Design a protein around this ligand. Structure first.
Ligand SMILES: Nc1nc2c(ncn2[C@@H]2O[C@H](COP(=O)(O)OP(=O)(O)OP(=O)(O)O)[C@@H](O)[C@H]2O)c(=O)[nH]1
Ligand SMILES: Nc1nc2c(ncn2[C@@H]2O[C@H](COP(=O)(O)OP(=O)(O)OP(=O)(O)O)[C@@H](O)[C@H]2O)c(=O)[nH]1
Ligand SMILES: COc1cc(C(=O)c2nc(-c3cccc4[nH]ccc34)c[nH]2)cc(OC)c1OC
Ligand SMILES: COc1cc(C(=O)c2nc(-c3cccc4[nH]ccc34)c[nH]2)cc(OC)c1OC
Ligand SMILES: Nc1nc2c(ncn2[C@@H]2O[C@H](COP(=O)(O)OP(=O)(O)O)[C@@H](O)[C@H]2O)c(=O)[nH]1
Ligand SMILES: Nc1nc2c(ncn2[C@@H]2O[C@H](COP(=O)(O)OP(=O)(O)O)[C@@H](O)[C@H]2O)c(=O)[nH]1
Ligand SMILES: [Mg+2]
Lengths: 423, 123, 423, 424, 430
């Protein structure tokens, strides 16, 4: 067995978690009561003496409103009270408050609940951490938790699904600060981080789904499909990415450069060919992070097909784009793809705005172009830190001003590292 | 292209498509340290709060010194009004008694003179 | 971050405080007897932010009423919603403050202040999670000004980690009640700079100018001015009282609106102005000088941050369009070193009588014009030591006067420094 | 709570006290025995177990004639006998006798009776002292009382209602001496003093009331209306109230400059708008002290309205006043306007000369023009003092000539002070 | 301040004192037996200023009658109202003063003064609140001048805080009782300058001139002169005996009428002038009363008021008249004759009214002036004094009783000093 534990931190982490676990249940046929009429689903679901299947998941949100959703939601019976960790006061959009003030208060309780899940695993692979960059809890507590998971589970893999901040649906002016702070502290402690740019997801819901003002649920329905595509071979008996260690093997040649770009197709409003959805994988309008792959070189590239996909069609599709397009890999790395087909068909939430399709594909590529997302964030950080705007709210929580600049230097080195390898 | 079979399983298969080989052969905190930093950030919080309360306690004592000074001003206004009034009342009493004594003294000199007149007559 | 403790002090404080409870009770559907009779559950979702839960399906305002003079209490008691307040939350003295800040702050105020803190401490313990305090008062008088800032200082010593928020009414020779307003106001601005986290500057000068020039009221009364105040106070508390994306609270308002601790004086604004419209007009009128409740031209400075709430059924797409449009057209009235410093929120429930409204919280460097006007009236009196003996007779030193005005002029310089800062 | 104790010294203070307490009883519906069929009148009336409402007042006079009329008049049961304090010899128009020779023999008794009144107050605002300038008791005994009150009660508020002397209704030729002497001695001890010029009241009684030879009774009934206006803010619960502390704060820019100018309108012989009666307060004909405010600068304006008055109308009236260039304020006064509005209309004594009106106003204004009144007094003083005329009557009672020049120099400093505060 | 103690000394003192008591008793409704027979209550309101209430519903004058000559008080008891006085207040010797001031002041009068102080103390201690004393006497004789000024001095010793008031009759060669009257008057004036607070100057010269020139009495008698005296004494005590605005008493009069302690000698005037027991067919009008009051023909001192300046003036009108019309005649008289009032005493002319006129008159005015012109009286006495003292005429009448020339030189010096200071303030400018 190859159990994975999912950890959801902050509002974004929890509400996306609701979307994913809902979608998992629809894919694996688990009812909202936990009952269920391939045994790979046990990597994400444990089982109780009453025959109930329970997500291997912990939820952390120190604002009782959000976690009360999970307690009274549609899939509320899936979860046990010791998986839900709340408080009274959230981080108030403050990284220092989430990391230092509340972090010192709740970290042992949170690790204790994680330990109770890990004691039910015979072969724990590691962790899947869902959190925002911009929230004070999603950024501040997550970084403390990743620090401690490296201590308490040194040999275990840690993957993140990180929500990259966007003005359209922002919740705080200090989100660029929290973003740089949590990326700095987490950098050594994550093996593979899939960033989800809220602006890219916003643009996809408007263009491809004909939604004027996408909600959190709109974005989360689309994000769940990507998470599902990334975890599908863990939850079913697939061939590619069959354990967390294989993600850094197939995508992360250098440990700091561990931020793959996700492209997904098709997104259809509620039947395209293998060649069409394959072409869509190379259109930046389908990326989950806004950047231009023409401004970079690939280090690794995997194609994760789902549903009715036959190998001869894939290899014909790949052959077509090779002749018409230039796809620059770095010198030291082979120019090509790792392809995986998962026969399990793409599933949508019934009544949602996503239509059921016959076949889908998610491309995971490690391009140096994703450094552009870091450059946009680093500039907004620079605009405010030059005047020390808002810094006093972070210092008031016991954080030292030097940590701002020490974090920013690490983001400077990360930008240079992306330059060096994209030479 | 060069296709390379990787795996075949129940719910899917994987392979690898190579379009061009690489131009270049090859590839070019503890638990105590964490608690030390969380505790230092807490003691900075507590130092800042101690310094805020220290300033507010300094304002409390200024508020007492203001109220105390106003009470001292009122007591000094009373003591100075008291000594001034007793000063003029005793000065007025001394003056008035001194005037009445001179008046009765002049009338007594006349009394002596009337005796000299009656003495000069029998003489 | 659930409950707010509300305090109203002095004649002005208790008049506009009563008008406030009158207005938001009608919004949440509470009658003067404390019973709920509304038609929507949106009204009761966060009603515990301001109302306590009394046995018998009764809602009692979490309000504390304070005055050194007993007359105002009686006027509030016999007012429209007089019976809704907890009768043992009335704390009134007997001998007034004599329009004298020194009497409210030092002498008469001290003798009553512990009776007030007892009632504050009782309401604080019936709180699941105390969010902070909001105080209504004037700065030109003696009780709300001198005893109100004494209350603030003592509450900060007892609750150093709670937010302090004030609605502070600024004096104007156009609507004066006493000849010593420049002294009373300057001595209080000194206190507010040091001891509050957020202050709404309600300028009687602006309320009068709006009534005379825009509302065509030839002879404005306090009833006309207070109509603007109640509308503004309803607007700037909407995000605290009704649910939304931001889960707004007073600490989050301070984090995103206050880049530097001393610069926490807000310019309120409201549209439409009414005596006792479309989205593109609401957006424009809101940034118009004729809608500012502080007598400052925002086009005379630059916005550091702007928080705006739209109430009523309307296209948030169209609203978000116009807000971005205005920002781009008037780009020279916003600082460039704070990305995304204009945030929009929406609430479906319109205020009473209106079908669409917009309320503006601005942190503008133009607010220095309010403080320069008070500084000029202060220096005009203080250079001749006019009326100074009524303050020295209470125990004050002249130094407190010069120190308070130097601090206020420093605040002016500080606002100017960030008016001229560039990227 | 919020009690004011009234002290009436000398014939002028006592007789004006008669007019005022009679008017208060009518305003509050109190019968001459103190029985009565808004509890704010309690600031001026204590109450006995029998429901009897007794003024918080002392009547003091060194001679028994005037107070004997109270003891046998209409309101002889209104006061306790211990509140009516008389000696047997008056001051014979001599400050020195009122303050020393005759005044020291009764000062302890007066303070003991005032202290018993103070013991019946839970929140004493202060004292109101009614007296004349020219009388020997009104001048000398009031000065002694004010000094002794400062000792017994510290900085507790002490306010005056002073009768400025006029030749037409005079009683002594040394009245200018008594005036300057009591003004010097009392200056440190009074927080605020409302002056009433008998000649100004004399002229109003002739022009507005068509009274050919006004008597004290005619003068006092008009004076009582002004007094009632001042204290109505303390005796009635109205819209805008002004307590003793707010009077002192808003009318006195410097400790010595504490002499507001009273004006009253309408004065009609037995309805004018709020704007009309307000504009009348700045016409020099309605002023209680003869002077020309257009030749001076205002430093503070306190308008006390009573009756049928709406705040919108007061705002509109005062806004008009702020446009008139003939009404000049000092450079250092961003605004000098304070407004009080009590809703109970002005009461008139049946059988009097004043007509019942629906609204009225009394303005208290601190203007540099009142120094003109100090100039006329100081000149009359100088005429006689240059020859030491009559001074021997004061020296014979124990006073020294140095007390005269020291008092006259203080009045010179006072005149100069009005000049200084009027510059820019 | 209610009770006044009255003292009359010598022949002239007891004569004008008796007439004073007849006149004010009629004004207050008291008959020669002491019983009140009047109709109004105002007659009785302040009647205790001059009368004690003796049991039996009677009123006894608070009066002390003094003379070294026994005969003059026999005539008092014999005259009308002789029976009204307290019999124990008669104090008589058996030898007069022979028109000799020294006999009255130093020898015979001093041997009787303790007997007078007996009666003075009994009437003074019985007083609730003693105003002071009023003394009637001549200055030209021996008892009233000599023993009268001695009495003043002795009374001032025991009652120094009370007011000392006199009606002092000045001698005149037109109505003379001896050639040494200039001596007696100068010696008495010396005492009066020092020991009294208020002195009314009753000049026999003016009284004779008025009787002869205005009343056309070819040979006037003391009865004729004393009709003018009692009319004046009634007028100048009206404000003490009846209720008015000023609550007038003897000290208030002194305070307001005497700017300098030595200048306390008043010039009284009266209108209308009449002969005794004569019916007035036509009453006087307020303009007539006012103009005739400031007329030199109406002064009871032989001084022209237009030869000096008034320091202070007190005027009392009696009868039913318009206080408004009075006020406008008085203020007019002042404004027209502005040059006879000092300018440096503001409001130095005071007016009072009493509704009750004196007997026989529907309307009357009485004038009390402190005018510098009164120096003409003292100059007249001083010239007459000097003409004798140059020659030491009759000095042995005085040295024979114990006196010395120096006491004459001193008294003459002090009266010439008094003349100088009247002249000083006559010329004083503002
Ligand atoms: N895609 C997506 N983004 C979300 C969702 N909820 C919040 N966000 C984003 O998350 C960021 C804010 O951080 P959150 O994690 O929601 O809040 P938090 O960390 O609990 O914030 P605190 O109040 O400081 O404790 C913003 O950039 C939001 O746009 C969600 O449901 N879906
Ligand atoms: N308006 C008014 N003025 C009065 C009244 N009575 C006296 N005066 C004035 O008061 C001044 C005289 O002072 P009074 O108070 O009467 O005298 P007093 O205090 O009794 O002092 P003495 O009588 O000298 O012992 C004069 O200027 C009078 O005009 C009065 O009833 N009304
Ligand atoms: C939008 O309206 C309101 C918001 C809040 C509030 O908590 C809040 N503001 C911000 C904010 C402010 C400025 C720039 C920004 N960029 C991103 C976020 C942000 C974040 N949170 C409170 C309110 O009143 C109680 C409001 O109503 C007027
Ligand atoms: C007027 O009539 C009399 C008044 C008094 C009397 O007490 C008195 N005079 C004055 C006085 C005098 C002069 C100038 C003045 N300016 C102001 C007052 C005043 C004040 N008081 C006594 C009288 O006779 C006993 C009178 O009768 C003739
Ligand atoms: N906007 C408004 N301002 C007021 C009101 N009442 C008083 N003021 C202002 O408050 C100041 C006077 O202070 P006030 O509250 O009356 O005195 P306090 O009782 O000692 O606090 C002046 O600037 C008045 O203009 C009111 O109802 N509305
Ligand atoms: N006016 C007036 N003068 C008198 C009367 N009797 C005497 N004299 C004058 O008084 C002076 C004589 O003094 P007199 O009283 O007879 O002497 P005495 O009795 O020893 O004091 C002379 O100047 C007389 O003119 C009188 O009845 N009326
Ligand atoms: Mg008196």
């Amino acid at each position: 067995m190859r159990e994975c534990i999912s950890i959801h931190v902050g509002q974004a982490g929890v509400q996306i978690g609701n979307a994913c676990w809902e979608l998992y249940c629809l894919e694996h046929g688990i009812q909202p009561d936990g009952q269920m009429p391939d045994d790979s689903f046990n990597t994400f679901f444990s089982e109780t003496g009453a025959g109930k299947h329970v997500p291997r998941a912990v939820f952390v949100d120190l604002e009782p409103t959000v976690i009360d959703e999970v307690r009274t939601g549609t899939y509320r019976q899936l979860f046990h009270p010791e998986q839900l960790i709340t408080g009274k006061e959230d981080a108030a959009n403050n990284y220092a408050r989430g990391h230092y003030t509340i972090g010192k208060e709740i970290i042992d309780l949170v690790l204790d609940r994680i330990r109770k899940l890990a004691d039910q695993c015979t072969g724990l692979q590691g962790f899947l951490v869902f959190h925002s960059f911009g929230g004070g809890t999603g950024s501040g507590f997550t970084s403390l938790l990743m620090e401690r998971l490296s201590v308490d589970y040194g040999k275990k893999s840690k993957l993140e699904f990180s929500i990259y901040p966007a003005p359209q649906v922002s919740t705080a002016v200090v989100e660029p600060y929290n973003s740089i702070l949590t990326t700095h502290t987490t950098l050594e402690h994550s093996d593979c981080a899939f960033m989800v740019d809220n602006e890219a997801i916003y643009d996809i819901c408007r263009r491809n789904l004909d939604i004027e003002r996408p909600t959190y649920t709109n974005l989360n329905r689309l994000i769940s499909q990507i998470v599902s595509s990334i975890t599908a071979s863990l939850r079913f008996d697939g061939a590619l990415n069959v354990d967390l260690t294989e993600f850094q093997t197939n995508l992360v040649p250098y440990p700091r450069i561990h931020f793959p770009l996700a492209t997904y197709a098709p997104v259809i409003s509620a039947q395209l060919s293998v060649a069409e959805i394959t072409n869509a994988c190379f259109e930046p309008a389908n990326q989950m992070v806004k950047c231009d792959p023409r401004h970079g070189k690939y280090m690794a590239c995997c194609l994760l097909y789902r549903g009715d996909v036959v190998p001869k069609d894939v290899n014909a599709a790949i052959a077509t784009i090779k002749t018409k397009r230039s796809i620059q890999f770095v010198d030291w790395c082979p120019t090509g793809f790792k392809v995986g087909i998962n026969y399990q068909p793409p599933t949508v939430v019934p009544g949602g705005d996503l239509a059921k399709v016959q076949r889908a594909v998610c491309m995971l590529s490690n391009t140096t172009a994703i450094a552009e997302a870091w450059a946009r964030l680093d500039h907004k950080f620079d605009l405010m830190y030059a005047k020390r705007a808002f810094v006093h709210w972070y210092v008031g929580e016991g954080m030292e001003e030097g940590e701002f600049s020490e974090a920013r230097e690490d983001m400077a080195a990360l930008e240079k590292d992306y330059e060096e390898v994209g030479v | 292209m060069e296709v390379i079979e990787l795996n075949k399983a129940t719910s899917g298969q994987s392979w690898e498509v190579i379009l061009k080989p690489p131009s270049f052969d090859g590839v070019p905190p503890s638990l105590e340290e964490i608690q030390k930093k969380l505790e230092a950030a807490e003691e900075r919080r507590k130092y800042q709060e101690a310094e805020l309360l220290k300033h507010l306690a300094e304002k409390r004592e200024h508020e007492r010194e203001v109220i105390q000074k106003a009470i001292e001003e009122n007591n000094n206004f009373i003591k100075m009004a008291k000594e001034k009034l007793a000063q003029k009342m005793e000065s007025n009493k001394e003056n008035r008694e001194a005037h009445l004594a001179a008046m009765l003294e002049r009338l007594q000199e006349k009394d002596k003179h009337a005796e000299e007149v009656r003495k000069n007559k029998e003489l | 971050m659930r409950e707010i403790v509300h305090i109203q002090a002095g004649q002005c404080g208790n008049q506009i405080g009563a008008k406030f409870w009158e207005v938001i009770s009608d919004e949440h559907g509470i009658d003067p007897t404390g019973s709920y009779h509304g038609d929507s559950d949106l009204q009761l979702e966060r009603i515990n932010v301001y109302y306590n839960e009394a046995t018998g399906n009764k809602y009692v305002p979490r309000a504390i009423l304070v005055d050194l003079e007993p007359g105002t209490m009686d006027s509030v008691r016999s007012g429209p919603f007089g019976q809704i307040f907890r009768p043992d939350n009335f704390v009134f003295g007997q001998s007034g403050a004599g329009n004298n800040w020194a009497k409210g702050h030092y002498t008469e105020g001290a003798e009553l202040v512990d009776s007030v803190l007892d009632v504050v401490r009782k309401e604080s313990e019936s709180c699941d999670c105390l969010q902070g305090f909001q105080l209504t008062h004037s700065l030109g008088g003696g009780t709300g000004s001198g005893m109100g800032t004494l209350l603030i200082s003592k509450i900060r010593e007892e609750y150093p980690d709670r937010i302090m928020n004030t609605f502070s009414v600024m004096p104007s020779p156009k609507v004066s009640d006493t000849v010593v307003e420049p002294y009373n106001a300057t001595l209080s601005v000194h206190q507010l700079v040091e001891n509050t986290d957020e202050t709404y500057c309600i300028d009687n000068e602006a309320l009068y100018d709006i009534c005379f020039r825009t509302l065509k009221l030839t002879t404005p009364t306090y009833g006309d001015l207070n109509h603007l105040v109640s509308a503004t106070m309803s607007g700037v508390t909407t995000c605290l009282r009704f649910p939304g994306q931001l889960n707004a609270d007073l600490r989050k308002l301070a984090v995103n609106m206050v880049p530097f601790p001393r610069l926490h004086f807000f310019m309120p604004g409201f549209a439409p102005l009414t005596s006792r419209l479309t989205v593109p007009e609401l957006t424009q009128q809101m940034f118009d000088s004729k809608n500012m409740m502080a007598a400052c031209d925002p086009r005379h400075g630059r916005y550091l941050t702007v928080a705006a709430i739209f109430r009523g059924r309307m296209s948030m797409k169209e609203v978000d369009e116009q807000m971005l449009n205005v920002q781009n057209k008037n780009s020279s009235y916003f600082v460039e070193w704070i990305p995304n410093n204009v945030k929009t929120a929406v609430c479906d429930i319109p205020p009473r009588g209106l079908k669409m409204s917009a309320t503006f919280i601005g942190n503008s460097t133009a607010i220095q014009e309010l403080f320069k006007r008070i500084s000029e009236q202060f220096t005009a009196m203080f250079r001749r030591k006019a009326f100074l003996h009524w303050y020295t007779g209470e125990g004050m030193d002249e130094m407190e006067f010069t120190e308070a005005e130097s601090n206020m002029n420093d605040l002016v310089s500080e606002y100017q420094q960030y008016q001229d800062a560039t990227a």
